[PDB]
Amino acid sequence: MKLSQDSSQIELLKELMDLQKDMVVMLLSMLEGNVVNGTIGKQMVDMLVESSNNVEMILKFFDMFLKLKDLTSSDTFKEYDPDGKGVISKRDFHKAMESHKHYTQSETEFLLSCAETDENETLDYEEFVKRFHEPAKDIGFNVA
């Protein structure tokens, strides 16, 4: 939640996401050799229910930063910046968001807050997706 908004905490976010990936790896190692309806799985799901809200908001984070490639590759997004650099105004990005309708108002707001903007509110969409989508799906495959 907090580090995604700022811009001087990219390395800290990367380290944290690697730590989360290792934690999920350990959980899968616990789930190794588990029969159907096992005690280990029961404790799995009891822990998840205990930490339901955090898991829910992490999953929202993941859906949020994984739909980016789907929206970015769209011709509707390509229209707003046919140039290769694709520097797109913040409210131009907002109009693309609203046209796609895949995001909501809150998702749009938080994504715009996370997306750094230049003097003309123009953000390099390629750099943004590289920064917020490759760690995505990579930490997320373990969760899936």
UniProtKB/Swiss-Prot annotation:
Disease: Ventricular tachycardia, catecholaminergic polymorphic, 1, with or without atrial dysfunction and/or dilated cardiomyopathy: An arrhythmogenic disorder characterized by stress-induced, bidirectional ventricular tachycardia that may degenerate into cardiac arrest and cause sudden death. Patients present with recurrent syncope, seizures, or sudden death after physical activity or emotional stress. CPVT1 inheritance is autosomal dominant.
Localization terms from the record: Sarcoplasmic reticulum membrane
Cystines in this chain: none
Induction: By TGFB1.
Domains as described in the record: The calcium release channel activity resides in the C-terminal region while the remaining part of the protein resides in the cytoplasm.
Mod. after translation: Channel activity is modulated by phosphorylation. Phosphorylation is increased in failing heart, leading to calcium leaks and increased cytoplasmic Ca(2+) levels.
Family per similarity comment: Belongs to the ryanodine receptor (TC 1.A.3.1) family. RYR2 subfamily.
Lineage, opening ranks: Eukaryota, Metazoa, Chordata, Craniata, Vertebrata
Name by which UniProt lists this protein: Ryanodine receptor 2
Subunit structure: Homotetramer. Can also form heterotetramers with RYR1 and RYR3. Interacts with FKBP1A and FKBP1B; these interactions may stabilize the channel in its closed state and prevent Ca(2+) leaks. Interacts with CALM and S100A1; these interactions regulate channel activity. Identified in a complex composed of RYR2, FKBP1B, PKA catalytic subunit, PRKAR2A, AKAP6, and the protein phosphatases PP2A and PP1. Interacts directly with FKBP1B, PKA, PP1 and PP2A. Interacts with SELENON. In cardiac muscles, identified in a complex, composed of FSD2, CMYA5 and RYR2.
Function: Cytosolic calcium-activated calcium channel that mediates the release of Ca(2+) from the sarcoplasmic reticulum into the cytosol and thereby plays a key role in triggering cardiac muscle contraction. Aberrant channel activation can lead to cardiac arrhythmia. In cardiac myocytes, calcium release is triggered by increased Ca(2+) cytosolic levels due to activation of the L-type calcium channel CACNA1C. The calcium channel activity is modulated by formation of heterotetramers with RYR3. Required for cellular calcium ion homeostasis. Required for embryonic heart development.
Tissues where this protein is expressed: Detected in heart muscle (at protein level). Heart muscle, brain (cerebellum and hippocampus) and placenta.
